[PDB]
Ligand binder design. Sequence first.
Ligand SMILES: Nc1ncnc2c1ncn2[C@@H]1O[C@H](COP(=O)(O)OP(=O)(O)O)[C@@H](O)[C@H]1O
Ligand SMILES: Nc1ncnc2c1ncn2[C@@H]1O[C@H](COP(=O)(O)OP(=O)(O)O)[C@@H](O)[C@H]1O
Ligand SMILES: [Mg+2]
Lengths: 646, 302, 352, 333
Amino acid sequence: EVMRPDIVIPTIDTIKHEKIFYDLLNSKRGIILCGPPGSGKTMIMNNALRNSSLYDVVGINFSKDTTTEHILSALHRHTNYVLTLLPKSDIKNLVLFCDEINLPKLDKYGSQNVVLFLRQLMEKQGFWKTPENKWVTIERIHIVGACNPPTDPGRIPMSERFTRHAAILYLGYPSGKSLSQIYEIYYKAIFKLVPEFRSYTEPFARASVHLYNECKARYSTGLQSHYLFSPRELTRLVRGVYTAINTGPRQTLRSLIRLWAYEAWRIFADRLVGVKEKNSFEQLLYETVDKYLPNQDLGNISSTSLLFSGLLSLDFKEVNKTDLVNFIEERFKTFCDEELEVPMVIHESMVDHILRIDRALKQVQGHMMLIGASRTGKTILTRFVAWLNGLKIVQPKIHRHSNLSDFDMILKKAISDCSLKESRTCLIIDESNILETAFLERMNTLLANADIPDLFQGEEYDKLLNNLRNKTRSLGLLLDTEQELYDWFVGEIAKNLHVVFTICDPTNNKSSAMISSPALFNRCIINWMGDWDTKTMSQVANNMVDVVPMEFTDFIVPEVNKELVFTEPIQTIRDAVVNILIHFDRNFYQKMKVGVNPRSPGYFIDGLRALVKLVTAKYQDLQENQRFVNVGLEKLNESVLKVNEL
Amino acid sequence: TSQELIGNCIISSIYETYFGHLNERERGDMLVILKRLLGKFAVKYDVNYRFIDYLVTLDEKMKWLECGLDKNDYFLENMSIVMNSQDAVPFLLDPSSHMITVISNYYGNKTVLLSFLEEGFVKRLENAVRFGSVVIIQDGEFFDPIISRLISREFNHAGNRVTVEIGDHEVDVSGDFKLFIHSCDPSGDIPIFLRSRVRLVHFVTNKESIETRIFDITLTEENAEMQRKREDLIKLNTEYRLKLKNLEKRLLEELNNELMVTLNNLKKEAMNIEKKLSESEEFFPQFDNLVEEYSIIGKHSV
Amino acid sequence: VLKWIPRNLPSCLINVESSVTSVKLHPNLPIVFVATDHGKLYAFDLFNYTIPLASLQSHTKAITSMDVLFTNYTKNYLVIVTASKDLQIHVFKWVSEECKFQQIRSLLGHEHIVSAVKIWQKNNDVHIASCSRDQTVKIWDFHNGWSLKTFQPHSQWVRSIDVLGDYIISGSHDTTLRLTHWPSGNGLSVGTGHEFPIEKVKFIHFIEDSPEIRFRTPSTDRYKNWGMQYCVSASRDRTIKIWEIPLPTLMAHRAPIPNPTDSNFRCVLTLKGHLSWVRDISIRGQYLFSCADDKSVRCWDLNTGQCLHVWEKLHTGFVNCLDLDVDFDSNVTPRQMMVTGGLDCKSNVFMR
Amino acid sequence: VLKWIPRNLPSCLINVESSVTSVKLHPNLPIVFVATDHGKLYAFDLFNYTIPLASLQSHTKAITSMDVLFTNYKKNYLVIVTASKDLQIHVFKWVSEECKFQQIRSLLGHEHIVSAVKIWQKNNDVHIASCSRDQTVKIWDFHNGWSLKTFQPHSQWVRSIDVLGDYIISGSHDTTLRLTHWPSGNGLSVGTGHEFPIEKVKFIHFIEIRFRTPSTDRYKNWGMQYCVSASRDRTIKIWEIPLSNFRCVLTLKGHLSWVRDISIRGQYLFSCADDKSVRCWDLNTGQCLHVWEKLHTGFVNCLDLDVDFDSNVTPRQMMVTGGLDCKSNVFMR
Ligand SMILES: Nc1ncnc2c1ncn2[C@@H]1O[C@H](COP(=O)(O)OP(=O)(O)O)[C@@H](O)[C@H]1O
Ligand SMILES: Nc1ncnc2c1ncn2[C@@H]1O[C@H](COP(=O)(O)OP(=O)(O)O)[C@@H](O)[C@H]1O
Ligand SMILES: [Mg+2]
């Protein structure tokens, strides 16, 4: 019961907020919840409303394209037209819950429609019907809402005439003690699976809290625009630890520490960019493990030395690096034989990225946001991993002469395939696959919620409900209400649909909107693979130049500094060639003034392939020429010997 | 000449895959730093290396120059880079829009002109790929992502046939098909997916090209005797080298199965090569002095 | 005699230049046939395995499947049939006087790679059946050489087939099975329950007499007249599943037609325990043998459904194929030997 | 098993462009690696020998000798080392999945023509030792490519070498063959008695014969009991290394011409000479068992048989010879 998003561990802050919430709602007064994006507004409010015998809840999520027709339809399914508008329950009141009231957009003259509608309906206690023109008095329907601060982009500053009616409550981040207690409860619930380590629930929770605090204090938003942490990261750490323990083998203490460290690597440090930042995080893990888990016989906690995967066995355990590389090589050979053929070179970084993509593609409602340079191998690795997991890859064919109709019908086809035909789908979305902000809003809708509402409406809604009833009857299930059918539909979509975002230019304004979007950031798992480092370039170059004749001249080992050699210490001509190629790639990207943009390794790969072909051709020509001159010299010597003899 | 094969191959491959989108001064600076890197890691290389003198043959150079290419050596090197990009689709950036007829002359009647703004672009590109004609696409700054598979060359081999997927239907790939993408805006926005996967070649005119063109004009007009003598000596050296190799092949054919007359002819050809080398050994310093003399006019021009 | 279990160590280790794909066994003589990844068909002597007894390069691409048959007319000779990614099917003839391969003919008609070939004879009429990425299960003839019947039974591309008289079962890449009546081409039923593409599908034939068998004995006279009861399939979801063939509408001296109410495969027993894609399966007596990409060969049994012996680390690489002699044929002796073939360019044999 | 006697007629006759200088067998495949006189390397399939499986122009002059090895460690790949007159020891690996040759490195450093090479594997390291006509024999490293040691065993050229363990025995142009340690680099014993230069001088490893079986506990602990050397004096002589001079145990006769190469197959010894004949002389009785007449038109320069003393390499019954008539006979089973 940690996969359930509705569970709330009762602490002093939670009961305090629930008590003031009941005091405000019973006071006939709207409530606005404001705070940081991980404070816990939604879960506190849903816990307070679900566990009440006097209030029902209505779920509404605001987007930029939101009209009052959505609110009218949401109320109409929980009220009866008898004027006077009343909730269906006679004793229990009705509460209308709005998500992120900052996100509705101003019109051409600076006025959000829905907030003015809400101010009208909780100031005059009623509203005027547009097509019939009578005043529908509302007696006991309440309005609440949550919002991020208006400082960050996407959160529009809000009119005081609307907020003057609703009481404002601020929810700060919980303190260290509260987080420690909450995650102690979570870790006790996890370690109920393995009772022999039940005495370690407190140090794991304290270590996780300390790790989150240190990561929040170290990598501020001033370094990169996406270096923001929250308790949601800790909750995802707990969920990942439970998911790995549940399907894992029999565990030891060292295995548990390494598993938790791997989860910390995959959650707290896949958004990191700089190599110095990753080294600092590795030192942070070592310090945290030494401080809170004073255990010996602990191996390397580097990024490439923690390979936890379930491809090589029936259970989620640590796998040998070389065995995993051999398995990945053979699987990629089969994949290129059956699907599109790309001559890829296997290295440690690609293996690690395959592991983390596979980890994030096996989660329920697990989505990815791959950020890195072009030609780093994001689309091909995503296709390979989705082929490994049995998902079906859907790549939107979006070209220049395309509009919302083609993208929307592609989305509808994918959703219908997921629901009716019950086929898992990995939707790969590129930054060039979107063209306008409307596609971005469609992705926000599909990712924040489990459905896109306006795709199916009217005749489409009716045929969707008919198909849902047909599928439910064919599966031998009995669902009658349209709410139950819609819940089954959104559950099937959240189970059978994964969205992977491919971003090539993170400094672009469109990609900045993609990264800073609230629904995309709070749901996707960022995997900033970035540009290639020296070790990966060395491995690729050594795997590429080993198939060409290169060592055929005398070589003397050059004296050089230790920091100028990226490969193994120089012993032959091949290591020298690799060092020169990497050094020139670095110098070329330095003198081209890339700034801080990611450096595509496409030039390096093209240069390596051209060098291999050219060296092969030139060596063959040189060997032919040398054989020609030596056979001519031998014939000349034979002729002069025959002349001398005769 | 075998001790420096690897260095020359490295320089040529890097020159192809890196220097296609640089002007003359940047090309010189990065060539100098590449030579410094080669000398720091103790890898030998040819001291007087020239890209055209190593990878551009005389027949290819004459074929390119007779097709309409400019006499500039920069355009010769860029043309060689374009024709040596066998794996990736070359992206010709010609603001003057001059090279469409150049490539059309090179490939004759097989050249088919398309554009990214045509209403029937995709079906005629599919027809061209089926027939295998050489394709030139204009206005590359409006790259339609329908041919993203053709840019990335992500084919699947269906037995004896190579297959690419364009649109919603399957189309075969002919072995002789080639793709050239032409653009005319130096300030246009090339998509990063297209930019990282093409051989970006800049056929532009810059201040370094101004320097080179002023020197070319003053060489071809102020003293045409030196330039004509250089061209004549290069042509006769190439012809005598080909004749010498043919004579050596004939001599070994005779020796395997008059002979003294053939030996005398070979000796005369070798003496002619020696005389030509001796004559040309006292000609490059003269061009060096002319380079050192006509610099102030170039600085004034820039 | 049917309770034989291979020893913990291989009897002989056979070395081949490239990756071994399909391995069969000569029914009469102790000769191992190994088809590699160059298409180079081999033939080894079991007691003298240092050098191949014969070898031949027919296809220029990788052989994907293979099956053999010793003719029983009413002269007799073995008929090796090999198929490759070079789109053709080549039929061979094994001559023992010269101890060399002797290709008799070849078959064409597939416009993509072919992944499985099974050869059988009914009554003095040998037929060759195959399935490709064309999704077409074409049927050839051994004597005439012309194709007889073709059909497309799957949306995706069919991977493996099996034959029993007039009924052909065929798994496919669309992770579903389907039994099709061969003479009429009418798909009798379908089957679902696999989450990954199917690797091998074959019938679990009956045994004339046995002490206790559950999966190779008819439950009623209807199954006795039908001639088969169950089927076994192995796919890439690490699971071997046993199905039951549902009875369709039948008429005397008439083609069968599907039963809309009783035309679905029924999963009886599922067998888990393999650590990767179960590549090949084989049934001898009460024991069902299988191999996977876990570099291991397992020995299930049908009467109770759990593994008895696990041959872990049998190959340094993946394991690709097995072959055991047919136990339900009077003309084929079920001698005690089992042969495996791996991706590590080797082929272990267990004898005695 | 190890008592294989080849038949009186050839099974296959591989036809090359020029005279064949050195031949080696694939330790676990039916593939022969014949070396031409133009530096070209030809690999043939023993069941289809009409066309060469792969051909590569390695050197520019004639190949003098070559030896192969299957690595046992990191994938296990076969290594081919060839030496020629260009003072270069080229190293190749044979990718079986594509049946083509691939070049790793060229071992350089010799100032004169090389004569022979020998490849052996340590626990995890592979070494190369080659002897040149510059009166020096060097020990190489396969991966590193550097020179491990350089020792002069004699004052004249060296035409044959073999290394067993840490001890290497070389047969110089002078009749005084000497045995020297690899890491120590100090000669221990010398032996004379030949009337001409030594063409092949290799160890006789212990197997389970007259000289293979150790006679004393000290010799069994040392591992080396006897070595068989062939000189140009038309005789074959078997030595005995002391555990300060190398004695002689026997001296086989009957060679019409100079003996080029020898090969011990268990209890039987097979050799080829320049007299266009190959004789299988029993190592115990010292008498020739069967002699092949008119095997080749030219003079046989190389005879190759599978290694019998190695546990890794299967001692199969495949023996082939290489003559000077631009052909190579194959004996199978
Ligand atoms: N008292 C608590 N008990 C359990 N989980 C908590 C508590 N406080 C915060 N969290 C975690 O913090 C996260 C806040 O998520 P959410 O409420 O969706 O963010 P927002 O308030 O911005 O919508 C939740 O994932 C939850 O797991
Ligand atoms: N070992 C490797 N790792 C990553 N990329 C590689 C490797 N080898 C080649 N590549 C390049 O990666 C390209 C495919 O990557 P792709 O996923 O299409 O890039 P993008 O993520 O920008 O779409 C190929 O064109 C190839 O040139
Ligand atoms: Mg929130």
